[PDB]
Amino acid sequence: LPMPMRFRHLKKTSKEAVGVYRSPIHGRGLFCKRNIDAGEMVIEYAGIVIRSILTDKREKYYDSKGIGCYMFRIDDSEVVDATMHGNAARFINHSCEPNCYSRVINIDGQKHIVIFAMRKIYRGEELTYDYKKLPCNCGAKKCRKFL
Ligand SMILES: Nc1ncnc2c1ncn2[C@@H]1O[C@H](CN(CC[C@H](N)C(=O)O)CC2CN(Cc3ccc(Cl)cc3)C2)[C@@H](O)[C@H]1O
Numbered sequence: 001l002p003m004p005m006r007f008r009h010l011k012k013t014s015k016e017a018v019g020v021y022r023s024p025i026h027g028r029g030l031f032c033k034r035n036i037d038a039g040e041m042v043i044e045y046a047g048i049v050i051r052s053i054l055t056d057k058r059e060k061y062y063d064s065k066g067i068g069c070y071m072f073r074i075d076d077s078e079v080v081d082a083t084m085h086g087n088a089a090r091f092i093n094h095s096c097e098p099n100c101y102s103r104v105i106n107i108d109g110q111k112h113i114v115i116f117a118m119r120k121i122y123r124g125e126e127l128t129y130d131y132k133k134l135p136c137n138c139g140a141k142k143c144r145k146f147l
């Protein structure tokens, strides 16, 4: 199905497909509630597309208020800030053998970060993607040992 046609009713369908629980990788993570087919559009990484140069001061502000800072790097110029206007996708942890991957899609001139399943994902599994200094806890055989 075409990419804009696939961005269909993600809000309703992701609410039934994924949930947030404690993760053995780190803190809380995103896990699936039902089997997700390979190639399936899982969830949008919801948030505000902001200028990359603004992230330092935004993270400094959040940190000074004891508010967890949730951001996803688009490119060297833009970042999605999911801190205030985010959804469950902000809890997706890194893995060196991920079952998901992140892509920047464009629908009706608007940029959205969407998470896709790389393989069939089975009920109970944690959803992970390769993030674009910090030790890694994915626990995979082929672990890069750093994020
Ligand atoms: N494979 C991994 N191995 C080790 N650590 C990993 C791995 N994948 C992700 N992480 C950590 O999660 C951070 C990204 N966050 C994902 C969701 C996080 N698990 C959370 O519970 O908030 C959102 C960040 C904002 N949130 C604030 C926060 C800080 C500390 C704690 Cl305990 C809970 C929340 C963290 C990333 O920067 C790493 O620090």
Ligand SMILES: [Zn+2]
Residues within 6 Å of the ligand: 095, 096, 097, 136, 137, 138, 139, 140, 142, 143, 144, 145, 146
């Ligand atoms: Zn790893």
